Structures are given as structure tokens and as C-alpha cells.
């Protein structure tokens, strides 16, 4: 399922992520855009033999057990397959386990490279949220 940004933003915002751990809404929306380009079905395989799942490319070495990564801690405690639903709920409750661990939104590569230091409010304008 592909998200229109406002459709994404309102669901992140209804799920309480606007300014959750100091990160305003713009941040969450910009990182989903560069991390999966608003596609909850996105996948990516890194050099560690580990995959990123869905909308907020959550990695399987740590966050979920995918079955295929031998170093898992599966910290949001979910099947990485849940992270690919059409519905962001799990991606968000897990994305919330992530930003609360001492690293902050820098644990999203695309965020630190594409969103850190640009005006992220440009992502929710026009939306009525």
C-alpha cells in the first residue's frame, strides 16, 4: 500500500508520534518518504545479511526477528512480517521503541542524511491534521 503524505501524517499524528521524544510530525513523515517512499511493503537487504522492513525501514538484527538474521534481539518483539502491513500501527509502536533508545532519529540513515537540518514542516503543509 502506497501512502499519500497527508494520509500518512494524519495516521502518525492520530497514533501520537507528533513530538513524541521531541521529534515533531515533519520528522516522521520525511523519514518514511526517504526510508520507504511511502510504501508499507518496502524491503532492503544490507551487508550484514539483514533486512529492513516497510514504511520506516526497521532492521532485523535488532528490532524484529525476521527468521533469516542469526544476531537478532527482536526488540520491539514482533515478527518482522507484521512490519509490512498496509496499516502502520506496528511500524509506529516499534519506531517508538527505536527513537527512545540513545541514538534518537539518527537510527534512520535517510533521516540524518535527508531530513536532519532541513525544514521538515514542508512535509505536512497543506494537510489538515
Amino acid at each position, epitope marked *: 500500500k502506497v501512502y499519500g503524505r497527508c494520509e500518512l501524517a494524519a495516521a502518525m499524528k492520530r497514533m501520537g508520534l507528533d513530538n513524541y521524544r521531541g521529534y*515533531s510530525l515533519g520528522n516522521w513523515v520525511c523519514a518514511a518518504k526517504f526510508e520507504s517512499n511511502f510504501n508499507t511493503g518496502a524491503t532492503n537487504r544490507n551487508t550484514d545479511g539483514s533486512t529492513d522492513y516497510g514504511i520506516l525501514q526497521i532492521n532485523s538484527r535488532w528490532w524484529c526477528n525476521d527468521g533469516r538474521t542469526p544476531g537478532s534481539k527482536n526488540l520491539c518483539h514482533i515478527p518482522c512480517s507484521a512490519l509490512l502491513s498496509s496499516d502502520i500501527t506496528a511500524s509506529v509502536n516499534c519506531a517508538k521503541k527505536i527513537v527512545s533508545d540513545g541514538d534518537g532519529m*539518527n537510527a534512520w540513515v535517510a533521516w*540524518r542524511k535527508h531530513c536532519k537540518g532541513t525544514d521538515v514542516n514542508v512535509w505536512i503543509r497543506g494537510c489538515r491534521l
Partner: antibody, heavy 116, light 108 residues
Framework: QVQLQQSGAELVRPGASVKLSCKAS????????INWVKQRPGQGLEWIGNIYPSDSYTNYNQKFKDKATLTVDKSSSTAYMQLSSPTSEDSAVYYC???????????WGQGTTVTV | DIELTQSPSYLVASPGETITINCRASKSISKSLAWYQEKPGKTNNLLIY???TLQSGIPSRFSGSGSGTDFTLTISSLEPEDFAMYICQQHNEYPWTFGGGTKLEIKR
């Protein structure tokens, strides 16, 4: 106790290069953005740039990108800043500060006087 | 580059009274301002970050308000040691920019 401590004062002949250092401790270095700041008396503070240490991904103020190099030695947790040919104006105090994860700077180094 | 005007550059005050510094950005920095105290013989102190949030460990008497262009630092009950330089700094977009500094002198 998060602690950034920089190198000592420098006197440098015009145009000779000088490399400043900032040994980080108290946290896991590669995880925070390091910046470098400068202040001369009367000017306010100016940002040189930052770097993210697990990948040396560097962001440069357009005004400094021609004049300074930001580098890190992951192993020894030292952040570096060099100036390739300092002219008279570059005589200032240079500050390494850690990024709080928001863009503000929550710890600071003591500072380094570079006297060209 | 956001230009922050800080105001005034000098304030003198007597301990027990309240002071207020303003910070004006050249464009709206969406509540992304941070404030610093610089006392001589001391590393730079982050007081407040993102318009209103308190850095951990700081006395409550420190307060910020603002949203796009004007933001303020309110300092009530002046202690003889919280007499220092205060610097605002935008962190909404690159480059990170700072104000000019209010030198805050204890009065006599």
C-alpha cells in the same frame, strides 16, 4: 560524564596548516554528531560544520567548506578539524560541541585559541 | 541563513529581579531555538532547547517562549552567579546559527 576536551593553544605562521583535536568520552562516540564552532571577539559564534562519526558523513557551512576539513578517528574517539592555510582572521577560539540529537549542543569542549 | 537578532546586547540587573532577552529569527524556525549560558571559566551550558523544553538539571527559573520569529528567555530570581553571556541558536535548518549574546552584569 560526557566530556569533550580539545587540544592546546596554537600559534601558526600564516598559511601553514594546523589540525585541532577533540577527544570525546563518557558516551559512545560514533552515535553523536560532532560540530565545530568559532568565535572571534565582537562577532557572534559561527558554525563550521558537523560530521556523524560512524560514516564520516559531513555537513559544511558554505562559508567554511573551502577553508576547513572535519575528520574523525573512530578507534581513538577523536574528532579533528584542520585548516588548510589560516590567514589572520582565523585567529579565534574553536569549539567542538556534541549534538544533543535535536540540533542543539548539549556538551561543549573547553575551546582552542588558534593564533595565526 | 537565519539571522537571529538578540536583544538587548547589555542588560544589567540586581539579584532577585526578573530579566527577559528576546531573540528574533529572519524567518520562522518552527519553535527550533536553543539558549546558552556562557560564564567565564566554564564550558558552555545548554539551558533550553526547542523553544520551551528544559535541558535536564537546570533551575526552573529559566524559561523560554516563542514559536516562529520571536522567542524569549525569562530568568526570574537573579542569583549572583547567573550573570553571564546568553546566546540563542536556531536548530531548524542548516547552517546552525547563533545570536549575538546579551552580556548580563550583576548590578551595583
Amino acid at each position: 560524564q560526557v566530556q569533550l576536551q580539545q587540544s592546546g593553544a596554537e600559534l601558526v605562521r600564516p598559511g601553514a596548516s594546523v589540525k585541532l583535536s577533540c577527544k570525546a568520552s563518557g558516551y559512545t562516540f560514533i552515535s553523536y554528531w560532532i560540530n565545530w564552532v568559532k568565535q572571534r571577539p565582537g562577532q557572534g559564534l559561527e558554525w563550521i560544520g558537523n560530521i556523524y562519526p560512524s560514516d564520516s558523513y559531513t555537513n559544511y557551512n558554505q562559508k567554511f567548506k573551502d577553508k576547513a576539513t572535519l575528520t574523525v578517528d573512530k578507534s581513538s574517539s577523536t574528532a579533528y578539524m584542520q585548516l588548510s592555510s589560516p590567514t589572520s582572521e582565523d585567529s579565534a577560539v574553536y569549539y567542538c560541541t556534541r549534538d544533543d540529537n535535536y540540533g542543539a549542543m548539549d556538551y561543549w569542549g573547553q575551546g582552542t585559541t588558534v593564533t595565526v | 541563513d537565519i539571522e537571529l537578532t538578540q536583544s538587548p546586547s547589555y542588560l544589567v540587573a540586581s539579584p532577585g529581579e526578573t530579566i527577559t532577552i528576546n531573540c528574533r529569527a529572519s524567518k520562522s524556525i518552527s519553535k527550533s531555538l536553543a539558549w546558552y549560558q556562557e560564564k567565564p571559566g566554564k564550558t558552555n551550558n545548554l539551558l533550553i532547547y526547542s523553544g520551551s523544553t528544559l535541558q535536564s538539571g537546570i533551575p526552573s527559573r529559566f524559561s523560554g517562549s516563542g514559536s516562529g520569529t520571536d522567542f524569549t528567555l525569562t530568568i526570574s530570581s537573579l542569583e549572583p552567579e547567573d550573570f553571564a553571556m546568553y546566546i540563542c541558536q536556531q536548530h531548524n535548518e542548516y547552517p546552525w546559527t547563533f545570536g549575538g549574546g546579551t552580556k548580563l552584569e550583576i548590578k551595583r
